[PDB]
Subunit: 332 residues, 3 copies
Amino acid sequence: LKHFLNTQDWSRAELDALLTQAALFKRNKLGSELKGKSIALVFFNPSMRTRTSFELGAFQLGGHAVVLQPGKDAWPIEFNLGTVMDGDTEEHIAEVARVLGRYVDLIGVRAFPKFVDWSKDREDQVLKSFAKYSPVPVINMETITHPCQELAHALALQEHFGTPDLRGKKYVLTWTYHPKPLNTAVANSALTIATRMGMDVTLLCPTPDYILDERYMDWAAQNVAESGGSLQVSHDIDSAYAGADVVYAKSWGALPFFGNWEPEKPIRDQYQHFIVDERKMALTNNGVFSHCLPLRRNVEATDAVMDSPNCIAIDEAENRLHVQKAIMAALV
Amino acid sequence: LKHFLNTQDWSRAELDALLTQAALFKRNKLGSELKGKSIALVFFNPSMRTRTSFELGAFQLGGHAVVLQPGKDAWPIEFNLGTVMDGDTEEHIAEVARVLGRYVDLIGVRAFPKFVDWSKDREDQVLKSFAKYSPVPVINMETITHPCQELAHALALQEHFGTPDLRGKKYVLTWTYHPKPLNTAVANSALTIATRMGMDVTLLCPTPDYILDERYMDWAAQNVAESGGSLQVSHDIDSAYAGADVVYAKSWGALPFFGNWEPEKPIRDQYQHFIVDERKMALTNNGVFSHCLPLRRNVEATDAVMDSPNCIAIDEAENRLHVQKAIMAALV
Amino acid sequence: LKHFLNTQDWSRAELDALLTQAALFKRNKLGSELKGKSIALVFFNPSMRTRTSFELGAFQLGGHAVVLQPGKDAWPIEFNLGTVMDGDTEEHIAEVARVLGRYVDLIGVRAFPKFVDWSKDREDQVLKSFAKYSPVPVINMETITHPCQELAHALALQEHFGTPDLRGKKYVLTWTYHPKPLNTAVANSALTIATRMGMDVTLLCPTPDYILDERYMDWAAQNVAESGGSLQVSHDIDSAYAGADVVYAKSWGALPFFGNWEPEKPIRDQYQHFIVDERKMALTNNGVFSHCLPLRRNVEATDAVMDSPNCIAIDEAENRLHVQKAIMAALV
Ligand SMILES: CC(=O)N[C@@H](CCCNC(=O)CP(=O)(O)O)C(=O)O
Ligand SMILES: CC(=O)N[C@@H](CCCNC(=O)CP(=O)(O)O)C(=O)O
Ligand SMILES: CC(=O)N[C@@H](CCCNC(=O)CP(=O)(O)O)C(=O)O
């Protein structure tokens, strides 16, 4: 059974096919690829674009999406094995995935880390459990990676430059400020797809404590050696931005501080100058700027940058709809 | 771009066309006016009829409604401009409206005042922001006015009297009791449409403190001079009800007490006799009674009045579906 | 007007017709029985299978389900008559049911007891009120009985044994452990349908305090005399399980302790050995095991039992979709 858990699991040819089908769907939005079919959208965390785009995507292809929120409307779910369920969880994922598999044709799942212990969060237990027990394809709607975002982002870049080949472009993945410590998922995914696409990637972050999990740094290294791109880490803003063709910003909590955030608060607070403003963008090669959203204006990026004609964030957001339709079509 | 924010923004001819299309849709509920199209229903407050009628209306016309609740499932939204978003809000309406505009064909928004400062609530910031940033038509699902309710109400009245021309009828908009201070929206809208329709309107309320915002009293004055109706404020129950053809009740907090409600509590509590009962309705010219709902029985109106054959509240509620379908059809 | 409140209200012929239509729908899932029609799914409590199966069932038959949660998105509802609504409830069921009746073609309602006073909960006020005031058919999505579960369960059994005739089979309805006191609905329904089907039923529970309400014991007695089955209560595990063809487990709070649960805690806690494990199932005649779900593994039933080929819980869960489609088709 084929699932869409990570782009890293897919061959470059398969990903190129997905991006092309996405472009095709963007030209002809209504279809029958999902006629009479359905997808269960399981959300363990908030969402506006993901829920809306998947729900509309299902509708536009003749199917139907059922939106579920365990702990809210649906019953809370247990993922650990062999435990005595006398706690807060009401049922086990074994039953949840098997039951949904009798109803729907696809299952999407969104589950952010708990931010208590990265050793536990990095195992991707929720997503892996759905893929293990589900008799139908499972789609990652964001856990510790965000593959749907990767493709929406990639398509937006190929559209901007007018070509599917992004090799040679200088890509800057920069950490940015935020009052709270967030998920590294989008950053992990950006690093992954940017290198898979063969760009010259620079991971710009405040300190070594903000470097991404080795798993993704390794994927990136492997992707560069295969795509012909490059990878490097930087703690110097001006050098990183210089000559950049693309700048993608995202805020995330330092992995070393999982379960111990109050000491990280003062640390991030002394780097709010990482905010993407006109000055930094002016150092780029008339580069484009994007963000996965939701975005806090004048915190992660300034009003000027967001409203500049070089910001393609709205186009990338729109593309979530198109690439997800390609993903669902491919899996059914 | 044409939006449906207030009936006051529309010409009488346009409103008559809407009411006629609504009557047509009531005769032939299924259609293809929204085939393959979608509407985002953004709710910042509770709703039963509005969510249900819009959702079903979209379905019946071949489209699909996506229901969103910022702060619940969707991310909280910032509306103020140029501020540093380090608070509770996660994203700005500029991005929210632009993104939704890439997904849906229409956006409906429900956002009640915050009841802290009427000077701020009366600006209609949420609705105006959606209309400003959205590339697609925006529909008022109730903010400080409730135009969809106005048309459902108007159609019910024209149906009751068997004619679209309501000129000459004595219309009584009466305040009624409620344990809590509520939105003036429905009252503002009733005053607006009743005068736009050319009826002889009487705004019956306990004291001058309960008179509606000048904005609506002015709209009413302008509407009367154009429709041939009349407007007057009253604090005397029996004189107002006498010979009335229509009685529309709604409870609302006195505008002067925004941000200072505890002193208003004792005030409203001494006027619970404003409740619509058989005695008051017996003073009317065999008039009809209606309410926008939800309604607290034996508080806002008695069981007898609600169950009387003169109560058209259920018909008005049904009409929300028909007039909203006419509105969506007109905007697409 | 015909509603689906309880199987006990339906003749055996009508129920057999429903089960047969359910089997037919399971073979041909897409249809037009609900084309352009809609159902309002009103949930006062959590749900995963019920919401998902009804929503998908409506979609597969060409209709649309509107999911409502009073107190969450919809307004809270008052059911008592003639009271002064100055409390938490915003509107009365009289208005709610009448309004929904102008929008949808069917109304489903889920409302568990409040667990404070069984004398009040056993009256089934919510369900009865919807049936009383609704101009359209009402469907029980679980209140104090769970008729939809009864049919899904019955169909799964007929499928397992390869025949609609279950007479002669030894059926064991056993109480099982759970940290909290739960609804007797599923148990009441199991007892009802198992006897209606003519099986030899044994109600196995810890003590006389866990025996079901007389109403259901009476229905069972009446069903046995008509179907040719049998009914008996047992407090001995091994004797009950011996030679059983079917074992259905469910946990529920002792009726005598409604409104007084802390003293019941120690009582249930001394019977957690009622859990369905391999040892008890090995005493049966290679019998099948099922549960309505959600199920707490290693509490209500062990991992071994849940994963055994004799467990048909997933099939019963799937059948909720098919029997509910038969129910909606029959009522429209
Ligand atoms: C603040 C916060 O927690 N952010 C998330 C955004 C995820 C990407 N964004 C999306 O998928 C868009 P939507 O479907 O509207 O959430 C994060 O940090 O990973
Ligand atoms: C108590 C309360 O806050 N009431 C609202 C009712 C609005 C009109 N009513 C509707 O639009 C019907 P529904 O869509 O079911 O809310 C108010 O006072 O403005
Ligand atoms: C723990 C709890 O409260 N359980 C419920 C389960 C009801 C039957 N189960 C269903 O209808 C399945 P779903 O639609 O997913 O809830 C009870 O005890 O009655």
